[PDB]
Design a protein around this ligand. Structure first.
Ligand SMILES: Cc1cn([C@H]2C[C@H](O)[C@@H](COP(=O)(O)OP(=O)(O)OP(=O)(O)O)O2)c(=O)[nH]c1=O
Ligand SMILES: Cc1cn([C@H]2C[C@H](O)[C@@H](COP(=O)(O)OP(=O)(O)OP(=O)(O)O)O2)c(=O)[nH]c1=O
Ligand SMILES: Cc1cn([C@H]2C[C@H](O)[C@@H](COP(=O)(O)OP(=O)(O)OP(=O)(O)O)O2)c(=O)[nH]c1=O
Ligand SMILES: Cc1cn([C@H]2C[C@H](O)[C@@H](COP(=O)(O)OP(=O)(O)OP(=O)(O)O)O2)c(=O)[nH]c1=O
Ligand SMILES: [Mg+2]
Ligand SMILES: [Mg+2]
Ligand SMILES: [Mg+2]
Ligand SMILES: [Mg+2]
Lengths: 276, 17, 271, 241, 274, 271
DNA sequence: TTTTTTTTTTTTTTT
C-alpha cells in the first residue's frame, strides 16, 4: 500500500524539519530576499530573449556554487562543446575574457600561467561536464547524480532536445519531458536548473527591445510554468547592460515581481549588482 | 488538356453562331 | 431488467429525503452553493501559483478538525512530509516551512510533539505517498478508512482527450457509487489574446486544459483570481462557474491572505 | 400535430410540437438547463396528457429525478429547501396525486431496455439524458436509435453536449449555438429531425432568461429564435415571457 | 558520455593553441564587433526582398576565396551554377559581366576569357552545387571529403518548401552540423510582411523578430547580420549593416555604411555620417 | 551534384554565347533589359485597371511579330473567348462590343482572312479551364518547344499562405534550369484607409495579397495604375517594383488607352 | 493498408 497515516509519521517529519535548505544565488540581493535560495528537489527555470544573457548568468551562478561553496556541479551544456564552456570558466574565475582574446591565450601558453589557472580552479573534482534522443540524456543525468554525486545539475538549452527528436505532437513531448524531469529532481533530491526560450509576441515590441515578459511567454507548452518551482526572467534593452530580474513565480514563498537590477562587466565578465 | 492553335479553325465560328 | 415504476418507489424516496460541509473563508460560497455534498466532484481552478493547493489545504484542515470527518489527502505534486508540516504550521498559526529559525526551535523546546498530537492525534488525516493504481488506492481509502473527503492535487500528471474522458467518467462513477466528497484541482489553458490568468483576467469555463469533460461531469467549479504582479497580490476573487444543485453562479466574495499566518480569510470589498 | 411543449410557446407555434418516429435533440452547454427543460417536458406529458413516458437518466439516480418531479408539480423547490424535506414527513398525499397511475417507468443492452419500454410497457415518449457514455461507435449507435424510432414509431428525445469553441466566448456567456458545434461525430445532425438549443449568460447580469433556438426542422422548416423563458427561482417552472 | 573536467587538461590546452576568425569584406565596422568567423559558427544574413543579400554574401565568398586561401563551398539555390560562376568571374575582374552582351561577345573573341578563368580557378578553392536530408549529406561530403573551410547556403525557404517544426528541425540540424566539425556556415533568410506603416523595401528598420517562419532562426544563430536600404529614396545605393545578435562578443547595433557601385558591382566601404 | 570549379571550363564558354523586348513602352526595356531564360515576371494592378489587356498585347507582339512560341494559360475565360480577343485585338477593332461587327465579318468571308494570318505559323498555344498544371506546363515547354508561358488569375488557383507559397516555389523551380520566360498575373489586396485602387493610389511592393512569397521568388514585378474616375480615365502608368537583374525601380512611362481599336498606345504624358 | 471528431501551441494574413 501507499496510504501513509499522519499519526505514524512523527520520526520522518522530525528528521525532515531538522536537516536541505539554503544555497543562495549570486549577483543580486532581491533574488535571495524573495526566493530564499535554491533548495534540493526544486526546479528553477531561467528565461530571456535571444542573446540576452540566460547562460552567462547561469555559468556565473555555477562558478560560485562550485568554488565558494564546494558543491559538485554537473553542467549539461548543449549549446557549445566542452572545449569552450570549460575554458570560459577559467577567465570568469580569473576575471578576464580568455576566449575573446588571442593575445592572452598565447601569453598563458608561453609563461606557464595556464597550469596555475587550471590548478587553482580544478584542484578538486567539482565540475563534471557533458558533451553531445531524450532517453540516454536522463540516464547520463542520473549517472551524474548517483555515481558522481553532483549537488547542482544545469540543463542548458532544452529546445534542442524537444526539436531534435522525431515527434508528431511537440506539446505532449514537452509535457512528458517536464514531468519526468520534475520526477527525477524530486526523487533524487538535487537542485536542477533548466534553461529555455520565449515565443514571438503577437504585436508590439520585442523581448530584445525592452518588452516586459509575462508568464505565458514561455515557448513550446504550458507545462513549463505549471511544473516548475521558481521562474526567473532576465530583461534588458540592447543602457544595454542594465539587466533586471523578475521572479514570475515563487512556490515556496509568495512574494514575486521585480527582484532588482544587475550590471554586466564587459572587461571581466561578471554580473555585478546595481543600484538604479 | 492543352489545345493547339490549329484546333480552333471552325470553333470560333461555332462560338459566334 | 433494470426498470422501476414510479408507483413502487415510495419506500426508497421516504428513506432518501429523511446542507452539507461548509467552506472556510469567503462566506458567499456556502451561501451560494450550500456547501459540499456527498457524492459530488468539485473542481478548483486557477493559474500557476495563484493558491489552489493552499485554498484546499485550509478546507482539509477545517474538515478534519472542526467537523471530525475523515480526510484523505493525495498530493501527487509534492511529498507527504511537506504537506504534513504545512498542516501543522497552518493549524498553529505560525508559518513553519518558510522559517528556519523556528524549525530548529520547536524540536529542542519539546513542543513539536505537543503540536503533533493536537491535530494528528486522531486517525483523521490519511495521506497518499507517491491510472488504475490511483483509483484502486482511492477505493482502498474509501473502503478500509471511511473517508468522507478525498482531495486530489494534480489531475494533469496522471496523463502520461479520450484518456481524460475515461478518467473523468471513472472518477464520477466512483464518487456517485461510494458517495464520497471528491475535490480535484486542475489547471487552465493558455489564452491566445489579451492578459494572462496570473494578471487578473477572469477565468471562463472554456479555459481548462485537456478536454471538455472537466466542465460536463463535475457538479461545481470554483475559480480563484488574483493579480500577481499588481498593486496588491493578496486580494483574491472567488467565482462560482457552475452549480447543479443550486443554479446560481457568479462572483461570490473576496479574501485576503495574511502572509504572517497564511489563512485565506474574507475581507470587505464592494468593487 | 402531436404532443405540445410546455414553456416557450413559440416551439409548437413554429415546429408544431413532437411527432411519432422522430429523434429530438436537446443540446446546450453545461448548466444551461437541459435536464430542467426535459424534466418539465416529461412531467407535462404524463399528467395532463396521460401517455406513458419512459425516462432514462444515466446521469443521476432514480430517487432525485422523482423528488424533483414531486417538487415541480407541487410548486415547491424540494431538494434545495432542507426544512420542508422534514416538514412534510402529507408526503403520501403529494406522492399518490402524481404517481397514482402506471404512467412513468424509470431506469436505474440499452436498446433492449428501450424496446421493453416500448412494447412491454407501452411508452409513447422515451427520454434519454446522457449519450456520451453510451465516431464509428457513435455512428452505429445513432443508426440503431434511428432504426428503433423508425420501426417502433415512438417519440424519442436524446440529449448530448456541445463542442469546445476554439475562438471567442463560451456558450455559458451567451454565445449562440450553431449546428456544427456538436461532439462525437457529424451524425447528430444528419439522423435527427429537430434540434433545440438553450442559450443563457451564466456569469452574467441575469442568468434566469434563456433564449430558445431551433437548429433543424424537416417538417415545418422554419428555424431561428423562438422565444424567451424566465425561470422563477421560487418555483422552478420555465415560463414564457 | 559524461566527462570529468580534470581529464580535459590536454584538450583544453590543444584548443588553446589552434579558432581564428575570418575577416569580412566591404565593411570594417562588422569585424570590430564580431571579431570574424570561427569554426562552428552559424552566421545568418537577412534583408528585405531585393536589398542585397546575395551580392554581399557572394562578395564575401570571393574575398575569402581569392585573397585568404580558404577553400569555399557554395550552395546557391536561387540561380544555376553558370550564373553564379559568371558572377564570380565578372566580379573578380571589376566589371559587370552578365548585364552586358557587348563585353561577353568581346572577351570570347580576343582570348582573354581564359586569363580571367585561370586566375580564379587555378588553385581550386571554389566548389559549387548543382540543383532536406540528402542536402545535409551532400554538405557533409563537401566538408569532409573535399575539405572546404566555409559553406554557404542560400534561400532557405526553398528547403522548407507545418513549416515551423520543419524550420526548427532544419536549423537544429545545421547548428549541430556546424558544431564539432569546424566549418563556418553562412545561412541566408528572408523577412515577413510588416503589419502597419511602411515596408521593409521602403527603408523601415528591421527588428530581430521579423525573421519569417519561426522564432528558432534567431535562437540557434550565433551572429545575425541585417541589411537595409531605401530603393525609392534619394540615395538607393547606400546600404546599412545592423548586427542584430552576437553571441561571442555581445555588441549589437549599427555596424557601418556601404556604397554600391552600379558600374563594377562592388559594395564598398562608404563614408556616410548620419 | 557536388561540382568543382574545374569542371566548368566549357559550360561557361557555351553559356556566354538575350532580353526579350517589351512592346508598347520603351521605358520598361531601359531599366529591365528584357527577359532571360529563367525569368519570372509578375504583373498586377487594381480591380479592373487592365492587366490582361496589357499582357494580351505583350503576347500578341511576341507571337506574330518577333517569332517566339508563346503559350497562354488564360484562366479567366475559356479558349474561344480569348481567341476572339486575340483576333479582335490583332485586327485593330473592338470585337465583342457590337453584334453587327461580329456578324459582318462572316457575310463576306473575311473571317477566314483573320485566322490564317495569326494561327498559321503555330506561334500560339492555348490552355483550357495545382500540381496537375505544372506537369502540363512541363510538356508545353519541353515537348512543344515554347519560350514565353503566361498564367492568369492566380486567385482561383489559390490557410491560403502555404498553398500559394508552394505554388510560387514550384513555378520558380520550374523556371530555373529550363529556360522559359514565365509571366504570372496576380491581384492586389483591398486598401485599408486613404484612396482606393480605382482612384490612383501609388502601389507598394507589399500590396500583393495572399502571402509575402509573391515578391521573394519573382524576378521582375510590374504594376499598372489608372484613375478611371479622374479627369483622364484613359491614361495608365507603369511602375517597376522589383528587378533582380539591374535594380532600377520606379515609374517606367505613360501609355494612352483607346476606346476605338482596343489597343493602348505609347504616350508622352508629363508630371 | 484508408476516411472522419477533440484539443493545446507557434506563425503568416484575411473582409
Ligand atoms: C548578460 C549580458 C551579456 N552580454 C554579452 C556577453 C555574451 O557573450 C553575449 C550573450 O551571451 P549568452 O549569455 O550566452 O546568450 P543567451 O544564452 O542569452 O542566448 P542564446 O543561448 O539563445 O543564443 O552578450 C551583454 O552584452 N550584456 C549583458 O548584460
Ligand atoms: C492564495 C495566495 C497564495 N500565496 C502564496 C503562498 C503560498 O506559499 C504560495 C504557493 O501557492 P500555491 O497554493 O501552491 O498555488 P497553486 O497550487 O495554485 O500553483 P501550482 O501548484 O501550479 O504551482 O502562494 C500568496 O502569496 N498570496 C495569496 O493570496
Ligand atoms: C434553465 C435554467 C436553469 N438554472 C439552474 C437551476 C438548476 O438547479 C440548474 C441545473 O441545470 P441542469 O438542468 O442540471 O443543466 P445541464 O443538465 O444542462 O448540465 P450538465 O448535465 O452538464 O451538468 O440550472 C437557472 O438558474 N436558470 C435557468 O434559466
Ligand atoms: C546591394 C545593391 C544591389 N543592387 C542591384 C544589384 C543586384 O543585381 C540587384 C538585386 O540582386 P540581389 O542582390 O541578388 O537581390 P536579393 O538577394 O537581395 O533579393 P531576392 O533574392 O529575394 O530576389 O540590385 C542595387 O541596385 N543597390 C544596391 O545597393
Ligand atoms: Mg545560451
Ligand atoms: Mg498546487
Ligand atoms: Mg444533466
Ligand atoms: Mg538573392
Amino acid at each position: 500500500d501507499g496510504v501513509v497515516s499522519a499519526l505514524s509519521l512523527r520520526e520522518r517529519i522530525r528528521e525532515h524539519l531538522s536537516s536541505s535548505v539554503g544555497l543562495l544565488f549570486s549577483g543580486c540581493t532581491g533574488i535571495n530576499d524573495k526566493t530564499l535560495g535554491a533548495r534540493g528537489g526544486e526546479v528553477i527555470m531561467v528565461t530571456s530573449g535571444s542573446g540576452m544573457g540566460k547562460s552567462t548568468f547561469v555559468r556565473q551562478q555555477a562558478l560560485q556554487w562550485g568554488t565558494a561553496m564546494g558543491k559538485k556541479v554537473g553542467l549539461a551544456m548543449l549549446q557549445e562543446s566542452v572545449e569552450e564552456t570549460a575554458e570560459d570558466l577559467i577567465g570568469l574565475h580569473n576575471r578576464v575574457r580568455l576566449r575573446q582574446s588571442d593575445s592572452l591565450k598565447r601569453e598563458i601558453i608561453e609563461n606557464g600561467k595556464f597550469d596555475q589557472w587550471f590548478d587553482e580552479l580544478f584542484g578538486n573534482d567539482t565540475f563534471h561536464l557533458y558533451d553531445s534522443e531524450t532517453d540516454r540524456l536522463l540516464a547520463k543525468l542520473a549517472y551524474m547524480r548517483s555515481g558522481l554525486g553532483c549537488d547542482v545539475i544545469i540543463l542548458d538549452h532544452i529546445s534542442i532536445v524537444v526539436s531534435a527528436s522525431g515527434e508528431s505532437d511537440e506539446r505532449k513531448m514537452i509535457d512528458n519531458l517536464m514531468t519526468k524531469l520534475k520526477g527525477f529532481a524530486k526523487s533524487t533530491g538535487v537542485v536542477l536548473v533548466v534553461i529555455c526560450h520565449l515565443k514571438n509576441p503577437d504585436k508590439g515590441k520585442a523581448h530584445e527591445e525592452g518588452r516586459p515578459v509575462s508568464i505565458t511567454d514561455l515557448r513550446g507548452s504550458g507545462a513549463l510554468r505549471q511544473l516548475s518551482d521558481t521562474i526567473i526572467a532576465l530583461e534588458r534593452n540592447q543602457m544595454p547592460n542594465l539587466v533586471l530580474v523578475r521572479i514570475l513565480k515563487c512556490r515556496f514563498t509568495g512574494d514575486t515581481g521585480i527582484a532588482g537590477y544587475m550590471e554586466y562587466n564587459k572587461e571581466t565578465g561578471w554580473l555585478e549588482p546595481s543600484s538604479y | 488538356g492543352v489545345v493547339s492553335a490549329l484546333s480552333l479553325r471552325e470553333r470560333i465560328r461555332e462560338h459566334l453562331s
